[PDB]
Amino acid sequence: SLMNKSQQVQTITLAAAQQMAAAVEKKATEINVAVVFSVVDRGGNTLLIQRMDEAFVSSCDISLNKAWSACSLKQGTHEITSAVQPGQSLYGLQLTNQQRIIIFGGGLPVIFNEQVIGAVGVSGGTVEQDQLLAQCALDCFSALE
């Protein structure tokens, strides 16, 4: 055959990041919560981090790493929780990668054209809230343009 020497991939943009920030900020407001929102591009690289003024300062690292975890492992941070419990197959996964791997909900990959173009991360509510606001961002994304 011919070798593929380079491949074509889609990355999410700041434009799109910026818009999902506003969705999240508007949804978080009416469920009466202050969160950090993060979006990473397709390589896991920080595009946006945005912290509501009443949100936990502890939640900026968390929110970023949920995005990076969601993009890197290609799934929600909620989907790895069961695998990392004492006694489960991937127990100790949470200790790798300088502890960047987040293992509770709040981080989602962004899927465009059967492909992971980036990810989002929300922190500073309950875990159920984080994840609801994370899907909320995705639902904004898919609507755009």
Cα distances (Å, whole numbers) of residue 37 to 1, 44, 90, 95: 45, 15, 27, 23
Report the C-alpha gap between 1 and 3 in whole angstroms: 6
**Least Å from the CB of residue 4 to a copy of itself:** 5
Asked if 52 touches a copy of itself (CB under 8 A), the answer is yes
Q: Which of 23, 28, 33, 49 binds a copy of itself (CB under 8 A)?
A: 49
Asked if 23 touches a copy of itself (CB under 8 A), the answer is no
User: Would the CA dihedral through 83, 39, 144, 124 be positive or negative?
Assistant: positive
Interface positions, 92-131, toward a copy of itself (CB under 8 A): 92-104, 112-113, 117, 126-128
Q: Do residues 58 and 30 touch, judged by C-beta distance below 8 A?
A: no
Of 62 and 122, which has the nearer Cβ to a copy of itself? 62
Q: Which of 73, 120, 134, 136 binds a copy of itself (CB under 8 A)?
A: 73
Asked if 32 touches a copy of itself (CB under 8 A), the answer is no
Asked if 31 touches a copy of itself (CB under 8 A), the answer is no
With CA atoms as reference, report the closest residue to 74 among 119, 122, 39.
119
The secondary structure element, H or E, covering residue 35 is: none
Question: For 116, phi and psi rounded to 5 degrees?
Answer: -95, 110
Task: Using CB under 8 A, count the residues that bind a copy of itself.
Answer: 74
- Draw the binding track, 53-72, toward a copy of itself (x: CB under 8 A; -: no contact): x--xxx-xxx--x---x-xx
**Least Å from the CB of residue 136 to a copy of itself:** 16
